[PDB]
Design an enzyme around this catalytic site. Sequence first.
Site, PDB file in Angstrom:
ATOM      1  N   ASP A 127      20.761  72.902   1.527  1.00  0.00           N
ATOM      2  CA  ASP A 127      19.352  72.887   1.994  1.00  0.00           C
ATOM      3  C   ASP A 127      19.385  72.633   3.496  1.00  0.00           C
ATOM      4  O   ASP A 127      19.845  71.569   3.935  1.00  0.00           O
ATOM      5  CB  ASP A 127      18.613  71.780   1.228  1.00  0.00           C
ATOM      6  CG  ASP A 127      17.127  71.747   1.483  1.00  0.00           C
ATOM      7  OD1 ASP A 127      16.664  72.400   2.446  1.00  0.00           O
ATOM      8  OD2 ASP A 127      16.360  71.130   0.702  1.00  0.00           O
ATOM      9  N   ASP A 138      12.135  75.606   5.894  1.00  0.00           N
ATOM     10  CA  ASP A 138      12.928  74.826   4.933  1.00  0.00           C
ATOM     11  C   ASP A 138      13.292  75.774   3.781  1.00  0.00           C
ATOM     12  O   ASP A 138      12.377  76.272   3.134  1.00  0.00           O
ATOM     13  CB  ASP A 138      12.056  73.658   4.450  1.00  0.00           C
ATOM     14  CG  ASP A 138      12.868  72.636   3.666  1.00  0.00           C
ATOM     15  OD1 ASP A 138      14.033  72.939   3.310  1.00  0.00           O
ATOM     16  OD2 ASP A 138      12.366  71.536   3.375  1.00  0.00           O
ATOM     17  N   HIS A 207       6.071  70.694  -0.425  1.00  0.00           N
ATOM     18  CA  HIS A 207       5.242  70.019   0.603  1.00  0.00           C
ATOM     19  C   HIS A 207       4.722  70.977   1.642  1.00  0.00           C
ATOM     20  O   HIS A 207       5.355  71.996   1.964  1.00  0.00           O
ATOM     21  CB  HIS A 207       6.090  68.915   1.279  1.00  0.00           C
ATOM     22  CG  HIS A 207       7.375  69.444   1.843  1.00  0.00           C
ATOM     23  ND1 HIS A 207       7.572  69.867   3.142  1.00  0.00           N
ATOM     24  CD2 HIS A 207       8.553  69.608   1.164  1.00  0.00           C
ATOM     25  CE1 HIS A 207       8.828  70.266   3.246  1.00  0.00           C
ATOM     26  NE2 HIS A 207       9.434  70.122   2.092  1.00  0.00           N
ATOM     27  N   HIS A 215       7.029  67.269   6.644  1.00  0.00           N
ATOM     28  CA  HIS A 215       6.154  66.990   5.520  1.00  0.00           C
ATOM     29  C   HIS A 215       4.772  66.717   6.120  1.00  0.00           C
ATOM     30  O   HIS A 215       4.572  65.598   6.561  1.00  0.00           O
ATOM     31  CB  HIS A 215       6.684  65.724   4.792  1.00  0.00           C
ATOM     32  CG  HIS A 215       5.937  65.506   3.510  1.00  0.00           C
ATOM     33  ND1 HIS A 215       4.625  65.874   3.318  1.00  0.00           N
ATOM     34  CD2 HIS A 215       6.344  64.918   2.353  1.00  0.00           C
ATOM     35  CE1 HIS A 215       4.244  65.554   2.095  1.00  0.00           C
ATOM     36  NE2 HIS A 215       5.263  64.957   1.485  1.00  0.00           N
ATOM     37  N   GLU A 240       9.398  74.452  -3.455  1.00  0.00           N
ATOM     38  CA  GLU A 240      10.757  74.119  -3.868  1.00  0.00           C
ATOM     39  C   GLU A 240      10.713  73.634  -5.308  1.00  0.00           C
ATOM     40  O   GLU A 240       9.734  72.953  -5.637  1.00  0.00           O
ATOM     41  CB  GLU A 240      11.419  73.043  -3.031  1.00  0.00           C
ATOM     42  CG  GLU A 240      10.790  71.708  -2.794  1.00  0.00           C
ATOM     43  CD  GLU A 240      11.558  71.019  -1.662  1.00  0.00           C
ATOM     44  OE1 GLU A 240      12.820  70.995  -1.687  1.00  0.00           O
ATOM     45  OE2 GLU A 240      10.946  70.495  -0.726  1.00  0.00           O
ATOM     46  N   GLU A 335      14.448  77.116  -2.938  1.00  0.00           N
ATOM     47  CA  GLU A 335      13.227  76.831  -2.114  1.00  0.00           C
ATOM     48  C   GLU A 335      12.984  77.978  -1.140  1.00  0.00           C
ATOM     49  O   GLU A 335      13.915  78.506  -0.506  1.00  0.00           O
ATOM     50  CB  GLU A 335      13.512  75.548  -1.295  1.00  0.00           C
ATOM     51  CG  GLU A 335      12.377  75.203  -0.311  1.00  0.00           C
ATOM     52  CD  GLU A 335      12.819  73.980   0.510  1.00  0.00           C
ATOM     53  OE1 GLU A 335      14.028  73.913   0.863  1.00  0.00           O
ATOM     54  OE2 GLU A 335      11.908  73.190   0.759  1.00  0.00           O
TER      55      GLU A 335
HETATM   56  C1  LIG Z   1      13.987  66.126   1.744  1.00  0.00           C
HETATM   57  C2  LIG Z   1      12.849  66.558   0.821  1.00  0.00           C
HETATM   58  O1  LIG Z   1      12.502  67.836   1.139  1.00  0.00           O
HETATM   59  C3  LIG Z   1      13.349  66.543  -0.630  1.00  0.00           C
HETATM   60  C4  LIG Z   1      12.348  67.014  -1.681  1.00  0.00           C
HETATM   61  C5  LIG Z   1      11.036  66.245  -1.546  1.00  0.00           C
HETATM   62  O2  LIG Z   1      11.257  64.848  -1.887  1.00  0.00           O
HETATM   63  C6  LIG Z   1      10.494  64.051  -2.664  1.00  0.00           C
HETATM   64  O3  LIG Z   1       9.676  64.618  -3.329  1.00  0.00           O
HETATM   65  C7  LIG Z   1      10.708  62.588  -2.770  1.00  0.00           C
HETATM   66  C8  LIG Z   1      10.611  61.852  -3.896  1.00  0.00           C
HETATM   67  C9  LIG Z   1      11.344  60.573  -4.005  1.00  0.00           C
HETATM   68  C10 LIG Z   1      11.330  59.783  -5.087  1.00  0.00           C
HETATM   69  C11 LIG Z   1      12.066  58.523  -5.168  1.00  0.00           C
HETATM   70  C12 LIG Z   1      12.060  57.714  -6.240  1.00  0.00           C
HETATM   71  C13 LIG Z   1      12.811  56.455  -6.280  1.00  0.00           C
HETATM   72  C14 LIG Z   1      12.810  55.618  -7.346  1.00  0.00           C
HETATM   73  C15 LIG Z   1      13.804  54.508  -7.330  1.00  0.00           C
HETATM   74  O4  LIG Z   1      14.677  54.445  -6.455  1.00  0.00           O
HETATM   75  O5  LIG Z   1      13.622  53.640  -8.179  1.00  0.00           O
HETATM   76  C16 LIG Z   1      10.503  66.234  -0.107  1.00  0.00           C
HETATM   77  O6  LIG Z   1       9.297  65.477   0.024  1.00  0.00           O
HETATM   78  C17 LIG Z   1       8.124  66.064  -0.584  1.00  0.00           C
HETATM   79  C18 LIG Z   1      11.579  65.715   0.894  1.00  0.00           C
HETATM   80  C19 LIG Z   1      10.969  65.444   2.304  1.00  0.00           C
HETATM   81  C20 LIG Z   1      10.331  66.743   2.795  1.00  0.00           C
HETATM   82  O7  LIG Z   1      10.087  64.315   2.483  1.00  0.00           O
HETATM   83  C21 LIG Z   1      11.292  64.361   3.260  1.00  0.00           C
HETATM   84  C22 LIG Z   1      11.372  64.559   4.749  1.00  0.00           C
HETATM   85  C23 LIG Z   1      12.600  65.334   5.163  1.00  0.00           C
HETATM   86  C24 LIG Z   1      13.853  65.038   5.504  1.00  0.00           C
HETATM   87  C25 LIG Z   1      14.432  63.627   5.484  1.00  0.00           C
HETATM   88  C26 LIG Z   1      14.959  66.054   5.688  1.00  0.00           C
HETATM   89 CO   LIG Z   2      11.653  71.001   1.367  1.00  0.00          CO
HETATM   90 CO   LIG Z   3      14.494  71.772   1.916  1.00  0.00          CO
END
Ligand SMILES: *C[C@@]1(O)CC[C@@H](OC(=O)/C=C/C=C/C=C/C=C/C(=O)O)[C@@H](OC)[C@@H]1[C@@]1(C)O[C@@H]1CC=C(C)C
Ligand SMILES: [Co+2]
Ligand SMILES: [Co+2]
Length: 354
Positions: A127, A138, A207, A215, A240, A335
């Site tokens: 990714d 993305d 997102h 995001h 995605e 994605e």
């Molecule tokens: C990186 C990423 O694109 C990954 C996919 C999307 O992530 C999520 O939906 C996050 C959910 C997390 C849940 C955690 C639960 C924990 C529970 C526990 O530990 O007990 C996406 O977000 C919608 C995400 C991203 C876009 O937000 C990130 C920013 C990007 C980066 C760091 C590359």
């Molecule tokens: Co993404």
């Molecule tokens: Co991505």
Amino acid sequence: KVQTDPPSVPICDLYPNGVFPKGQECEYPEKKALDQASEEIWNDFREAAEAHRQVRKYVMSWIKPGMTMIEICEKLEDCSRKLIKENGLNAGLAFPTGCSLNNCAAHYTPNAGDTTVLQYDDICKIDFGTHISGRIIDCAFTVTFNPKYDTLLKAVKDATNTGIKCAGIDVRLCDVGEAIQEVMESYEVEIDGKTYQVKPIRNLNGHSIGQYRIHAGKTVPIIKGGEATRMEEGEVYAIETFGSTGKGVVHDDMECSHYMKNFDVGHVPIRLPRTKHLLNVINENFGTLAFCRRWLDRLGESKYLMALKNLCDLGIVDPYPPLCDIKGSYTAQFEHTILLRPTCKEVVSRGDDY
Ligand SMILES: *C[C@@]1(O)CC[C@@H](OC(=O)/C=C/C=C/C=C/C=C/C(=O)O)[C@@H](OC)[C@@H]1[C@@]1(C)O[C@@H]1CC=C(C)C
Ligand SMILES: [Co+2]
Ligand SMILES: [Co+2]
């Protein structure tokens, strides 16, 4: 000129008039003034998408078991910097190269010293992101070498294509999630003598995307039961989907490698010297784009991990640790980035590969 063997010509030198290839254009589920007024923005996304297409083709030609994860990320990023014609915050990498393995679904890239080697039985989610002027692509795919995972990969690819087809102006986000789950759950797979019904990972989401903002605040669910907020004209989304043989839920796990400045936090005066210096490095090199610890190392930074913790505890930077299902489970991801243009939906990162 024409692109070279291992690609080395920047995309902007392949298209000398500054007009880049469109992705897949789709009627919503014809030549507006309003669409044409934003043509410089769509063009920037298309330059970033063509870089993404050419990098990923190159990666698929050489990625093999026996390489270390650091070797894979460094070879990929080298090519991406060359083809995007990296130039500070005006063009470059939007976020670190994810190469999450096996039960890990997202947000793993190796830190310095990681000795992990890619294995024949691994399922690796690649990714990675490119941008021009903050317009981010993305896009992600899954790499396997054993044919045992082929139906799990087909399930997820079909669910992602289903979400892309459902998307549109005035479409309820909860309806896209219900659609994606219905397709993904229609697949059953058999891996090493055990059978599974493929499950969407219910706490992972797509997102919306904003300028220098991976995001932008709206989430795209991949199961039923989400919000009836509608998609709007002019918005850009990463559609995605993630599928798993495990519980279908992720938790935080392993060392953290990915970090990003909080978009809404303003200027904060800092006197602590090492913390002040690191914040300046982040503001100069990344701004609000995500980065990893390998990208600080590359800039000659060292002794930064306590300054990085300080910025996290102050709320200036957020950590994004790897997100994994239970031990022994298999996860896969596909994605694309879509643009909700006035005249049509454009799957800007679509290729002839996926
Ligand atoms: C990186 C990423 O694109 C990954 C996919 C999307 O992530 C999520 O939906 C996050 C959910 C997390 C849940 C955690 C639960 C924990 C529970 C526990 O530990 O007990 C996406 O977000 C919608 C995400 C991203 C876009 O937000 C990130 C920013 C990007 C980066 C760091 C590359
Ligand atoms: Co993404
Ligand atoms: Co991505």
